[PDB]
Amino acid sequence: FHVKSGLQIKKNAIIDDYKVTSQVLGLGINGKVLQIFNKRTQEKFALKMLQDCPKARREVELHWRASQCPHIVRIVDVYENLYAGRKCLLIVMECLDGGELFSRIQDTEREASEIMKSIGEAIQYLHSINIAHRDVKPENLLYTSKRPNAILKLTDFGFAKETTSHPYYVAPEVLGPEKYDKSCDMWSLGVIMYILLCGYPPFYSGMKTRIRMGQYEFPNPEWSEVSEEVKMLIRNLLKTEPTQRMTITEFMNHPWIMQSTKVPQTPLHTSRVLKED
Ligand SMILES: Nc1ncnc2c1ncn2[C@@H]1O[C@H](COP(=O)(O)OP(=O)(O)O)[C@@H](O)[C@H]1O
């Protein structure tokens, strides 16, 4: 009987259990994400502050329900305190330090693969529980440590969304209509995989067009040493039509992804280019 705990919105002042500092781990939509310390254990953690409101509690739940996944940043616990006469939602997160995906990179095809593989997993799990991130951009991919074995994790559920309301032989369609399709998630993947391998994004900067038109290239030299197999994989991800685009399940099985170990240590110009513009 495997069961994890349900989420609990703590009401006591976060200050008693934690020690909040002025350091800024970073900025964004909701504001500053401060670095905090756990008194009794003295470990560092990220603190996110949301206005308490229905939409917010939904996000938090989704993320908390997905923290059981290795490659998703974990929510240690959440508070509902009173901030400025305003009822807020304080979220404590494991503190990722390694830095954003591309940074670490700039600062082998096989490595690019392995990276794609973990991002894939972050998505496979979310989807396997009916959730679409819908904001899988590089920025939201931080490394745990600076160490060489740091692990990659996806974060930010400000747009996370439930795709499911309300017979061994029945088709997935019949199971019911679930919209908000995660396809974009698979698109974000292509973009990322692209950038990794060469150092720049597929669609450059009438860009909104080149996209809708779905017109890009694997410019030489950059892609001169890249397999048509790897190339073919980007294409099925970069399909302009959702329903035509590859599935997360089909991605995790594609050879390049499923067998990183056995993938060419062919160098990539990435860092260089990545640093050039
Ligand atoms: N758990 C974390 N560990 C380390 N840094 C974080 C963490 N969460 C957020 N950050 C920093 O704060 C910024 C805000 O991140 P994000 O989760 O995307 O929230 P939002 O997009 O709503 O601003 C990130 O770009 C990052 O630099």
Q: Is the peptide bond before 255 cis (omega within 30 degrees of 0)?
A: no
Closest CA to 136 of 149, 151, 126, 147: 126
Question: From atom 13 of ligand 1, which residue's Cα is the shortest distance away?
Answer: 26
Contacts of 200 (CB under 8 A, 6+ apart): 273, 274, 277
Domain with CATH 1.10.510.10 in the chain: 96-274
How would you class 180 by CB atoms within 10 Å of its CB: exposed for 0-12, middle for 13-18, buried for 19 or more?
Answer: middle
Do 76 and 94 meet the contact criterion of CB atoms below 8 Å apart? yes
Task: Round to whole Å and give the CA distance between 134 and 112.
Answer: 22
* CATH code for the structural domain at 14-95: 3.30.200.20
Atom of ligand 1 nearest to the CA of 26: 12
Question: From atom 26 of ligand 1, which residue's Cα is the shortest distance away?
Answer: 26
- CA 155 to ligand 1 center in whole angstroms: 7
Closest CA to 104 of 138, 135, 132, 75: 138
Closest CA to 102 of 225, 182, 29, 201: 201
The CB of 28 under 6 Å from ligand 1? The reply is yes
Task: Round to whole Å and give the CA distance between 138 and 154.
Answer: 9
Q: To test the ligand 1 pocket, which listed residue (21, 24, 25) has its Cβ within 8 A of the most ligand atoms?
A: 25
Task: Round to whole Å and give the CA distance between 18 and 43.
Answer: 10
Task: Round to whole Å and give the CA distance between 105 and 113.
Answer: 13
CATH of 96-274, one of 3.60.110.10, 2.40.50.140, 1.10.510.10, 3.20.20.80: 1.10.510.10
Residues annotated within a binding site for staurosporine = 94-96
Task: Round to whole Å and give the CA distance between 195 and 102.
Answer: 9
Residue 65's Cα: distance from chain center in Å?
A: 15
Task: Round to whole Å and give the CA distance between 123 and 117.
Answer: 10
The CB of 141 under 6 Å from ligand 1? The reply is no
Task: Round to whole Å and give the CA distance between 72 and 64.
Answer: 10
Domain with CATH 3.30.200.20 in the chain: 14-95
- CA 100 to ligand 1 center in whole angstroms: 10
Instruction: Judge whether 135 counts as a catalytic residue.
Output: yes
Q: Is the peptide bond before 71 cis (omega within 30 degrees of 0)?
A: no
Do 57 and 89 meet the contact criterion of CB atoms below 8 Å apart? yes
Closest CA to 48 of 20, 70, 69: 20
Half-sphere exposure of residue 132: CA atoms within 13 angstroms, side-chain side: 17
Closest CA to 156 of 44, 15, 53, 26: 26
Q: Give me the numbers of helices (H) and strands (E) for the chain, helices first please.
A: 10, 12
Beta bridge partners of 142: 100, 153
How would you class 184 by CB atoms within 10 Å of its CB: exposed for 0-12, middle for 13-18, buried for 19 or more?
Answer: middle
Q: Is the dihedral of CA 228, 233, 237, 239 positive or negative?
A: positive
Do 150 and 162 meet the contact criterion of CB atoms below 8 Å apart? no
Contacts of 94 (CB under 8 A, 6+ apart): 45, 46, 73, 74, 76, 144
Q: Determined by which method?
A: X-ray
Task: Round to whole Å and give the CA distance between 178 and 165.
Answer: 7
Q: What is the resolution of this structure in A?
A: 3.0
